[PDB]
Design a protein around this ligand. Structure first.
Ligand SMILES: CCCCCCCCCCCCCC(=O)CSCCNC(=O)CCNC(=O)[C@H](O)C(C)(C)COP(=O)(O)OP(=O)(O)OC[C@H]1O[C@@H](n2cnc3c(N)ncnc32)[C@H](O)[C@@H]1OP(=O)(O)O
Ligand SMILES: Cc1c(C(=O)NCc2cccc3ccccc23)oc2cccc(OC3CCNCC3)c12
Ligand SMILES: [Cl-]
Ligand SMILES: [Mg+2]
Length: 385
């Protein structure tokens, strides 16, 4: 790995190590006036396209590109299948820029073959809050891989973000790149045991027969926190206080405004689920998970694995274990087959007791143009989609 593209960028070399006394840009005093006003050049026959995710047909284009070409597991058994509705949610948060939703079309067919996106958010890293872009959904058509199109998309979005006087970004990826600020393994909790076996997600042994596996993962249909209920607009102030106060302990987290709390947490069916426990007009506990199904490649019986992904969870009237037990139950009540989580915040503390299994790799967290100490993933307090 020579990282010929990445070593041109303001990111740590593979062997850079910085102390906690270092928490600053690689390149400071940047000037918006000096940013290139020209679009990056694409190979002949391809063109930039600005996607309007609020237009159903453009959003469908992006949906099709990612359905066919996005992230797969290591066995190329499953492929993420973010819904069109979910995309609309993920990309139109407060003060989003349409111009940071960038496609690349093949001119001869008029088809989208590449995409990259960002949204703006304030990010607190080691107690310093910085306006950043949160980058996601980088995708190149499977037919056009290893042609160095991804550096083009990354340089063009970096240009458009710099035009807004933003000079840092946050992103995650399963591949190792220079250089993670933190690295968090994923774990899963089986809900529909038998389906997870049948599609090859989970396995059995002579010691764990099918019926024993179903008994091992069986959950009581009663909440530990009885009044946990879907979040409503009235709860926005309360969730802003409860989650805001909790997040301040972490080395890395988004600093949400009230408008951001309403966007990111008010529930949308098949997209985002937030439940709250109100006691005396105060929000005292919250659970939230989002829907990210995967397409099950070449399966006769099942086309989709319906997966809930843990988002932000806070308790002050129960244990974390009790709260996360209730999160699994609420995911089961909404028809999910499995509950997935990263070893961030307090999550790893409940994985053993709650019957989570360890997955097959890790999600690396990264900053662009930021020099700082790295840290264990329990100190991460942000989850990207
Ligand atoms: C101030 C603002 C700053 C804004 C921007 C911040 C930075 C945002 C950065 C993006 C954050 C995205 C976050 C995100 O979306 C979440 S991670 C999910 C990324 N998407 C997928 O994995 C979908 C399936 N794969 C693909 O579509 C292609 O394999 C992709 C497009 C990933 C790469 O296409 P390709 O046809 O396989 O490859 P080439 O075009 O020939 O390019 C090779 C170069 O790409 C470097 N590469 C490979 N994968 C990367 C990845 N996941 N991040 C960053 N860099 C990655 C690679 O190391 C090499 O550089 P190097 O030669 O130095 O080693
Ligand atoms: C990327 C990821 C993985 C992950 O890659 N797990 C392997 C895996 C198993 C089964 C089906 C799969 C389908 C597509 C890709 C991977 C699959 O596991 C997570 C568990 C929690 C959060 C995650 O990453 C978030 C959500 C997805 N986009 C980037 C940030 C991840
Ligand atoms: Cl260049
Ligand atoms: Mg390429």
């Amino acid at each position: 790995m020579d990282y010929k593209f990445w070593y041109t960028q303001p990111v740590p070399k593979i062997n850079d190590e910085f102390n906690e006394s270092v928490n600053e840009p690689f390149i400071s005093d940047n000037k918006v006036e000096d940013v290139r006003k020209d679009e990056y050049k694409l190979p002949p026959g391809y063109s930039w396209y600005v996607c309007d995710v609020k237009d159903e047909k453009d959003r469908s284009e992006i949906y099709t590109l990612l359905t066919d070409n996005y992230v797969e597991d290591d066995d190329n058994i499953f492929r993420f299948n973010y819904s069109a509705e979910f995309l609309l949610w993920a990309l139109t948060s407060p003060n989003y820029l349409k111009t940071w939703h960038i496609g690349v079309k093949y001119d001869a067919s008029n088809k989208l073959i590449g995409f990259i996106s960002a949204i703006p958010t304030d990010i607190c890293i080691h107690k310093r809050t910085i306006k950043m872009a949160e980058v996601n959904f980088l995708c190149v058509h499977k037919t056009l891989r290893s042609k160095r199109l991804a550096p083009v998309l990354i340089k063009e979005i970096t240009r458009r973000i710099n035009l807004e006087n933003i000079w840092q970004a946050i992103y995650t990826a399963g591949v190792y790149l220079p250089k993670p600020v933190s690295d968090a393994r994923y774990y899963h909790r089986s809900i529909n045991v038998k389906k997870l076996i049948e599609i090859g997600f989970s396995s059995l042994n002579s010691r764990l027969t099918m019926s024993r596996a179903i008994k091992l993962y069986r959950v009581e249909d009663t909440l530990n926190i009885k009044n946990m209920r879907l979040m409503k607009k009235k709860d926005v102030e309360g969730v802003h206080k409860l989650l805001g106060s909790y997040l301040e302990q972490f080395n890395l987290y988004a600093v949400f405004t009230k408008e951001e709390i309403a966007h990111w947490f008010l529930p949308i069916e098949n997209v985002i689920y937030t439940y709250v426990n109100e006691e005396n007009g105060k929000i005292k506990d919250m659970i939230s998970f989002y829907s990210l199904p995967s397409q099950i490649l070449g399966n006769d019986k099942y086309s989709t694995l319906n997966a809930a992904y843990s988002f932000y969870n806070v308790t002050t009237t129960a244990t974390f274990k009790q709260l996360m037990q209730d999160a699994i139950l609420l995911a089961k009540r909404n028809n999910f087959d499995v509950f997935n989580a990263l070893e961030v915040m307090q999550n790893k503390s409940v994985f053993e007791d709650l019957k989570f299994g360890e997955g097959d790799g890790s999600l690396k967290y990264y900053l662009y143009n930021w020099k700082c100490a790295s840290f264990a993933p329990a100190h991460v307090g942000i989850v990207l989609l």
